[PDB]
């Protein structure tokens, strides 16, 4: 299939990644840079993020979903369902609203596209209505991450997809903070894209620290596999 061939051929080996995020949460401004690599053959991403403005004023876990679904491993039987790769190299726009239960929300806009050989994820984030003392601005979330299916459906009238899912972040008191995600992706280019049947991506995420790193940061290891169309 000369289509399955094209965007797909961009992902066959290890692809370097750049992530840039500009954040304003309740007027707490901040900027994050990340670097790493993805290997979609294995559903594999390795990234390290650095707050380049000082202290990150939110918990690192709350940013994980925001900081690359083009690197999902789609099984061979499912390659016709891979919207994300099909949009490349021109890329796609990923928008979210993330509602933190009993606390504020994030609204995000990203552009995910190639810049030469580098896959780049440029992000703007605004958070509003947070409790200065809640789980988020109060830093009460644990530095870990649960696995989670992500459900994708076509959005044919926007020539894109909608994604919907809940993340539960462990709180330090043993309870959970729900973060309910509403997401929309739309290609940047005028060309055809693959519009998928309903399926999901299974995410596993592992958060760690670089022992030699003194800035505020996060090392993120994600494995991501498409399923649900047997």
Swiss-Prot record:
GO biological process, one term: bioluminescence
InterPro entries per the UniProt record, alphabetical: GFP (IPR009017), GFP-related (IPR011584), Green_fluorescent_prot (IPR000786)
Outcome reported for the amino acid change (mutating residue 163 to A): In GFPB; leads to enhanced fluorescence at 37 degrees Celsius
Gene3D superfamilies referenced in this protein's UniProt entry, alphabetically: Green fluorescent protein
Tissues expressing this chain: Photocytes.
Effect of substituting residue 222 to G: Suppresses the 399 nm excitation peak, leaving only the longer wavelength peak at 475 nm
Phenotype upon changing residue 67 to L: In EGFP; increases fluorescence at warmer temperatures such as 37 degrees Celsius. In EBFP; gives rise to variants with blue fluorescence
A Pfam cross-reference name: GFP
Consequence when changing residue 147 to P: Increases fluorescence at warmer temperatures such as 37 degrees Celsius
Listed result of changing residue 155 to V: In EBFP2.0; shifts the excitation and emission spectra to shorter wavelengths and increases quantum yields compared to BFP
Effect seen on changing residue 148 to D: In Cerulean; leads to improved quantum yield, a higher extinction coefficient and is 2.5-fold brighter than ECFP
Biotechnology: Green fluorescent protein has been engineered to produce a vast number of variously colored mutants, fusion proteins, and biosensors. Further generation of mutants led to more stable proteins (at 37 degrees Celsius for example) with brighter fluorescence and longer fluorescence lifetimes.
Consequence recorded when altering residue 42 to N: In EBFP1.2; shifts the excitation and emission spectra to shorter wavelengths and increases quantum yields compared to BFP
Keywords per UniProt: Chromophore, Luminescence, Photoprotein
Highest taxon, organism lineage: Eukaryota
Consequence when changing residue 198 to I: In mut2.1; shifts fluorescence lifetime from 3.03 to 2.50 ns
PTM remark: Contains a chromophore consisting of modified amino acid residues. Maturation of the chromophore requires nothing other than molecular oxygen.
Family listed: Belongs to the GFP family.
Purpose: Energy-transfer acceptor. Its role is to transduce the blue chemiluminescence of the protein aequorin into green fluorescent light by energy transfer. Fluoresces in vivo upon receiving energy from the Ca(2+)-activated photoprotein aequorin.
Assembly information from the UniProt record: Monomer.
Name the UniProt record assigns to this protein: Green fluorescent protein
Organism the protein comes from: Aequorea victoria (Water jellyfish)
